[PDB]
């Protein structure tokens, strides 16, 4: 199961994002829950581009909430941590996975 490999690829950014005070563990476990479900639906069998689209949409929304709580709690534009590039680089990674798995639809392209 390579879904476990992706799911514990995404741990260190949320580790640093929790140890600096912007999320707490009681909700990063919730976003980890939904991320687990998304990764399973993604690299399961009989998957679909709409699953990729909703994963992209959810990760963009948690990126925007990350920036919102960054400028609200820490009152800075960024905290120069690992997270700030990580979340959009894994958005691009989702995009790359979806183009390799489904090069048909020009909408996702």
């Amino acid at each position: 199961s390579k879904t476990r490999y992706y799911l514990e690829q995404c741990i260190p950014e949320m580790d640093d994002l929790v140890e600096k005070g912007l999320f707490t563990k009681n909700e990063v476990s919730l976003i980890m829950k939904k991320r687990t479900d998304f990764e399973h639906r993604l690299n399961s069998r009989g998957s679909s581009i709409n699953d990729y689209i909703k994963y992209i949409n959810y990760e963009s929304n948690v990126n925007k909430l990350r920036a919102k709580r960054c400028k609200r709690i820490l009152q800075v534009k960024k905290t120069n941590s690992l997270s700030d590039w990580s979340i959009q680089q894994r958005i691009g990674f989702i995009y790359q996975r979806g183009t390799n798995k489904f090069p048909q639809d020009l909408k996702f392209w």
Binding site: R4, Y5, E8, Q9
Partner: protein, 59 residues
């Protein structure tokens, strides 16, 4: 017949041997990323191409 007879060659006494054997490497007791990075052989060849004798440095 389960504990070994002497201390094997690269080590020198039993604290060396047990400090080698102290961490299980299975995917049960260790994570998947630490699994797949803990286990990979020293050589690793690509399956179907001729291996050149190395000519480094200053090409």
């Amino acid at each position: 017949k389960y504990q070994s007879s002497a201390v094997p060659f690269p080590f020198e006494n039993r604290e060396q041997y047990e400090r080698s054997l102290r961490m299980p490497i299975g995917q049960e007791w260790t994570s998947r990323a630490s699994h797949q990075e803990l286990i990979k052989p020293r050589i690793m060849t690509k399956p179907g191409q001729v291996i050149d004798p190395l000519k480094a440095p200053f090409k």
